Ligand binder design. Structure first.
Ligand SMILES: COc1cc(Br)c(OC)cc1N
Ligand SMILES: COc1cc(Br)c(OC)cc1N
Ligand SMILES: COc1cc(Br)c(OC)cc1N
Ligand SMILES: COc1cc(Br)c(OC)cc1N
Ligand SMILES: [N+]
Ligand SMILES: [N+]
Ligand SMILES: [N+]
Ligand SMILES: [N+]
Ligand SMILES: [N+]
Ligand SMILES: [N+]
Ligand SMILES: [N+]
Ligand SMILES: [N+]
Ligand SMILES: [N+]
Ligand SMILES: [N+]
Ligand SMILES: [N+]
Ligand SMILES: [N+]
Ligand SMILES: [N+]
Ligand SMILES: [N+]
Ligand SMILES: [N+]
Ligand SMILES: [N+]
Ligand SMILES: [N+]
Lengths: 300, 300
């Protein structure tokens, strides 16, 4: 089963899941084996600390039950790693708000705006009215692209002049969304990395200005990260988390990359729900994260 | 490809998958709507019990998620029905046997022999050696047809005189297949409906004689049914599963029919893996069943 998901994770299945099989066949459970396993986990971008946790738990349980063959570790791994993803398997519920406000954060070039469009189309297909806020105010090309997309897809896009104050754009966007009975407002933000502090202060200002119109907003702080950036995805995650406090994560480009294992780091180091995973070019390829499906396709 | 699949499933998409869209547009989630949906599912030959399961799960999920608009039901349906197919998405692996024995069961006039030829051609295209056994010994026309096909395609066909013992023909075919290093042996059988008892007992005899040469044979018991026969396809399945013990199902003629929903019944009532679906006249149109691809082409 899960043919399409397996196809997305093939390069990730090189090292994780079924990739363990060739590593365990006809081996004895000893320090050599745990070393090779640690190495294969690190290669998959699982991270030093997360790999340390997995190797430690596996070693202690194995030695306690004195498993004889290395093949028997496979199942244990499937459990351990599975548990990790299970702790971030909370889908996003955007119902019952006028509007439900999603603040989209992350650097540029990781599929953030693509995620905005896909989520917009999904929400509209679910019978909801969507509005966008072009809060990336200093990149005229990005804003105009978002506006042309809105015009082609009949979704309103709030924008201001190049160089406008993002918090003002998003403020006006919330006002217009409440006035027009919008169900979901998705607010884009600047994704420049240069000047970490400034971008952080800018996001905090956007939030504080949000609280003038609705203290519950933003209802979702969604970070977008790219799996094919390996451990960079981890750093970025921490960067934004310290500054605004994330509530959801979208992990894109899981297909066509061997760095998929980064998910286990992201899930383990932060425990923030992974709302969606991007496993293809289609709108439906931005899928709600289901930990069990992911594990089964990985370890098959 | 995917596009050709969607086009093949257009006539079934009238009522199922995307066919739900017009039914949910601008409607309120109430008993009237669930009644219209239940009716549309039954008309599509989804089956009474399976339709009840879908309607119940959909309703409970709706109330649990406090969905407002009927459009939002679409996704849940796509999941529900998808789950049904996901539980029978184990593809057929015919590797590593000398030969892998496929016992082809089913009635006549449902594409059984056509499926035999297509599977033979595919396996041969994959680099495997194929042999056929004309176990439908009492229909001289069928045997002669299978033989002329095998000679036209240079594939050996084991046969005996009209009225020979099918179990003997298949016995000789397994012996010769083991002797010639054949990878896959496909054995046809009688598909007469009159007097089930005779045919069923005949299949148990064929199996018992098979196990004299290879206790693992038959490695696959493949039922062939015709989707365009609606609930007849269900009955036949019930007939054969109780009688011989199936391990795979091929559903032919999914193109050009509005009764495609029968697949969801077959998957739900029996839980036997659906190995292939026939969506066209070409050799490649007998596709290995991928539940996710099928769902995506049906919906959206
Ligand atoms: C070209 O297609 C898009 C353009 C933009 Br801009 C986007 O962000 C809303 C999403 C998509 N899919
Ligand atoms: C100048 O960026 C802002 C825009 C609005 Br609107 C606001 O709320 C009055 C506060 C700030 N800082
Ligand atoms: C390739 O599937 C076939 C198998 C037989 Br046997 C046949 O009889 C001539 C026709 C077809 N298409
Ligand atoms: C008459 O059907 C059979 C054919 C063979 Br061959 C066999 O092996 C001795 C047993 C039986 N019953
Ligand atoms: N051990
Ligand atoms: N809001
Ligand atoms: N990011
Ligand atoms: N991007
Ligand atoms: N619009
Ligand atoms: N605007
Ligand atoms: N803007
Ligand atoms: N407003
Ligand atoms: N990233
Ligand atoms: N195609
Ligand atoms: N609608
Ligand atoms: N069959
Ligand atoms: N049969
Ligand atoms: N071929
Ligand atoms: N036959
Ligand atoms: N016979
Ligand atoms: N014989």
């Amino acid at each position: 089963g899960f043919a399409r998901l397996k196809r997305s994770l093939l390069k990730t299945k090189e090292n994780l899941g079924s990739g363990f099989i060739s590593l365990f066949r006809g081996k004895k459970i000893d320090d050599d084996l745990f070393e090779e396993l640690e190495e294969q986990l690190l290669i998959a971008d699982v991270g030093v600390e997360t790999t340390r946790k997995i190797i430690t738990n596996l070693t202690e349980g194995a030695s306690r039950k004195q498993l004889r063959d290395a093949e028997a570790l496979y199942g244990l791994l499937k459990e351990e790693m599975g548990e990790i993803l299970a702790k971030v398997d909370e889908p996003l519920n955007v119902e019952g708000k006028a509007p439900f406000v999603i603040l989209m954060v992350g650097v540029n070039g990781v599929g953030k705006t693509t995620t905005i469009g896909k989520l917009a189309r999904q929400f509209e297909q679910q019978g909801k009215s969507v509005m966008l806020a072009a809060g990336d105010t200093f990149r005229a090309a990005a804003v105009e692209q978002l506006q042309v997309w809105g015009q082609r897809n009949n979704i309103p896009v709030i924008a201001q002049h190049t160089g406008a104050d993002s918090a003002s754009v998003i403020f006006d966007a919330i006002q217009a969304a409440k006035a027009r009975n919008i169900d979901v407002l998705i607010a884009d933000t600047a994704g420049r990395l240069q000047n970490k502090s400034h971008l952080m202060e800018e996001l905090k200002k956007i939030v504080r200005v949000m609280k003038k119109l609705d203290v519950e907003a933003p209802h979702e702080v969604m970070l977008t990260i790219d799996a094919s950036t390996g451990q960079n995805a981890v750093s970025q995650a921490k960067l934004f988390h310290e500054a605004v406090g994330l509530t959801g994560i979208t992990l894109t480009k899981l297909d066509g990359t061997a760095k998929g294992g980064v998910i286990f780091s992201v899930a383990d180091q932060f425990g923030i729900p992974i709302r969606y995973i991007g496993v293809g070019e289609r709108i439906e390829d931005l899928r709600p994260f289901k930990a069990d499906d992911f594990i089964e396709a990985l370890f098959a």
